[PDB]
Amino acid sequence: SGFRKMAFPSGKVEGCMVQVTCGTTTLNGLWLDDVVYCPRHVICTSEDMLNPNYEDLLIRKSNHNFLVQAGNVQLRVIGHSMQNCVLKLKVDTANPKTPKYKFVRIQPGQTFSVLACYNGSPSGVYQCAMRPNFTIKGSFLNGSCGSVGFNIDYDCVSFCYMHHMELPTGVHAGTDLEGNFYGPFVDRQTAQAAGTDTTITVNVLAWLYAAVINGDRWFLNRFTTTLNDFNLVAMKYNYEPLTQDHVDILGPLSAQTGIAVLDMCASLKELLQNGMNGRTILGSALLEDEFTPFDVVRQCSGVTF
Amino acid sequence: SGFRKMAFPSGKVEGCMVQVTCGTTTLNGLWLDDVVYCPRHVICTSEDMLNPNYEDLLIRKSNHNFLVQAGNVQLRVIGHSMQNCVLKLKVDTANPKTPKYKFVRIQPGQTFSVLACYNGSPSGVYQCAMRPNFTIKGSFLNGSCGSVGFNIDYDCVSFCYMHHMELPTGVHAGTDLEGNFYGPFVDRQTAQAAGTDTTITVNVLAWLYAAVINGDRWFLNRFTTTLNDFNLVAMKYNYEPLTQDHVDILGPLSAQTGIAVLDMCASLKELLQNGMNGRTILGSALLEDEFTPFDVVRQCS
Ligand SMILES: COCC(=O)N[C@@](C)(C(=O)Nc1cncc2ccccc12)c1ccc(Cl)c(Cl)c1
């Protein structure tokens, strides 16, 4: 029993965290094989952040301008290239702690673990979801840039995020490991605002299935709904539309609990219109949307890494 | 900015997780140096669970009855001893991945990370707190026994918990790494019930200070209170009494935010009386009590 917000074990990623220093800026880098990946804004100071020509700033840099530190060992930079918003520092040493890894771009609603680092040193791990507005509600302080988001698939680490910045509302923006931003964000100093967020519907439904698996049934009802009627109601409460893909994905949880997805939709529909009424689901007074259907299965079955 | 429930990086503890098998039972062990620590109930049979004599069952066991597996390598048991509710299996290999560590016994209200394992294999990490009733609200399935609770402070792993059992309410009971149970629990199938839980008041106040640091001030008020008047109100909502130690502990957060501890106590009384009114504090509609004053300072500086 129990349902906690659980991150993947961070050991395989901790062995990849390095400190990258370029001039006055110190952020984190991800050392995989003989390459160190980090946000390209490390080559930026104060005027280099306002209106920056990154190709122009990078051509002016030499390999010895980047001080890379793996623990107490300085890594020798032998090359530098830029792919989108990520800087790639070729080093002389291949990381012996390099795990089996992939660079994957995730979709909104998908969750991943974040290993928050400061000065190439891991300080915490947490689980969060790529919001529909492409931001992450992270916990980051100055110096966290270059902290990575990942999923662990069997023995393979799928890197899906690199932290670049904090928006004025306290939410975070970053890129996949190929330097492509998540959302309409750019890596510079300009007016950028996160779009109005929406709730990840498939994730709330998965979390309601997890509540049923844990003995919380108070919200269940005898009613069912059509997918169209549910989406008409969901749109009104700023909830993401539920597709037939989502209904299919929730199939195993529906089979395990004996509650059809559209029957669970009718419970969510009542919860949106009438509220919790002083009651809680899995210790929460709000509908949780940062557990995917796979996360629920993984935690309520016992999958290991 | 931001406030998340944050666990410590689990790498240093992952390198210590082994699988311990004794007869039909398979749970997790913690391999530190040449010793593997695990719950002593790994030696228990079917009829030897309601009233087990552990000294008697252990004297009947030999080193080859324990199959210890570190990844795909079978470790060789060369000794066995029992310290309270933990079994210590002396092995012939010192764990090369052994970090700088300590065994620390924590007090209720203290937080720690849990690395949940199944068959000596880490499946996930989460944060939780020692409840005032000495249980943890964990997420554990059968086979998670021997999973450990830890804190990491300046390169050193402080082991503070080892999972032993699930109570009938779904909450969990376990021991410190010296085998001493937290709470009035025993490692027997006897009728055991967790005492009625209470909210960790000092932790809620620390979390309200974290909300102020993050710009959330809606709950603040013009009032202050006496510690006695606060405790009289707190006990009515099943909140732990706030001691002068707690008031002292919240001093740095009080200095940083400019809100006196007893002034924040008056905010908390009002929150208890009125509720949230559709508003949230740090993305929560409930008062969070699983962040210590030390966690708040750590995360906000
Ligand atoms: C055959 O195992 C039955 C069982 O419950 N065994 C465990 C081992 C048990 O509770 N363990 C489990 C741990 N954490 C979550 C658990 C969720 C579900 C089930 C089991 C959990 C048990 C039981 C009674 C005692 Cl006194 C002790 Cl010390 C241990």
Sign of CA dihedral B153, B156, B157, B159: negative
Q: Are B141 and B133 in contact (CB under 8 A)?
A: no
Nearest to B40 by CA among B193, B171, B146: B146
Sign of CA dihedral B263, B265, B267, B273: negative
A168 touches chain B (CB under 8 A): no
How much is the CA Rg of chain B, to the nearest whole Å?
Answer: 22
**CA separation for the pair A155, A11 (Å, rounded):** 12
CATH for B1-14+100-197, options being 2.40.10.10, 3.30.565.40, 3.40.50.2300, 3.30.1360.40: 2.40.10.10
Q: What would the 3-class secondary structure string for A40-53 be?
A: HHHHCCCHHHHCCC
**CA separation for the pair B237, B198 (Å, rounded):** 8
Q: Cβ B285–A283 below 8 Å, yes or no?
A: no
**CA separation for the pair A18, A119 (Å, rounded):** 8
Phi, psi of A246 (to 5 degrees): -60, -45
B158 touches chain A (CB under 8 A): no
**Determination method here?**
X-ray
Give the residue range(s) of CATH 2.40.10.10 domains in chain A: 1-14+100-197, 15-99
Phi, psi of A22 (to 5 degrees): -140, 105
Candidate from A126, A172, A305 with C-beta closest to B123 = A305
**CA separation for the pair A87, A9 (Å, rounded):** 26
**CA separation for the pair A60, A45 (Å, rounded):** 14
Candidate from A2, A126, A304 with C-beta closest to B5 = A126
Q: Are A114 and A125 in contact (CB under 8 A)?
A: yes
**CA separation for the pair B176, B160 (Å, rounded):** 5
Angstrom CA distances, B163 to B1, B29, B182, B241, stand at 34, 10, 11, 28
Q: Cβ B125–A7 below 8 Å, yes or no?
A: yes
Is ligand 1 within 6 A of the CB of residue B142?
yes
| A237 Cβ neighbours under 8 A, 6+ residues apart | A199, A272
Q: Cβ B115–A9 below 8 Å, yes or no?
A: yes
Could you identify the residue written with the tokens 């928050």? A116
Nearest to A114 by CA among A182, A166, A162: A162
The amino acid at residue B285 is A
Contacts across the A-B interface (CB distance below 8 Å): 133
| Residue B296 DSSP SS3 | helix
Q: Which helix (H) or strand (E) holds A75?
A: strand A73-75
**CA separation for the pair A194, A135 (Å, rounded):** 7
Q: Are B110 and B134 in contact (CB under 8 A)?
A: no
Can you give the resolution of this entry in Å? Answer: 2.2
The CATH code that applies to domain A15-99 is 2.40.10.10
Tokens (6 digits) for B230: 């606060």
Nearest to A128 by CA among A3, A242, A287, A6: A6
**Selected residue of B3, B10, B150, B156 to mutate for chain A interface (largest A Cβ count, 10 A):** B10
Q: Are B294 and B8 in contact (CB under 8 A)?
A: no
**CA separation for the pair A109, B70 (Å, rounded):** 36
Domain B198-301, CATH homologous superfamily name and number: main proteinase (3clpro) structure, domain 3 (1.10.1840.10)
Give the residue range(s) of CATH 1.10.1840.10 domains in chain B: 198-301
| B261 Cβ neighbours under 8 A, 6+ residues apart | B205, B247, B250, B251, B254
Active site residue A41: yes
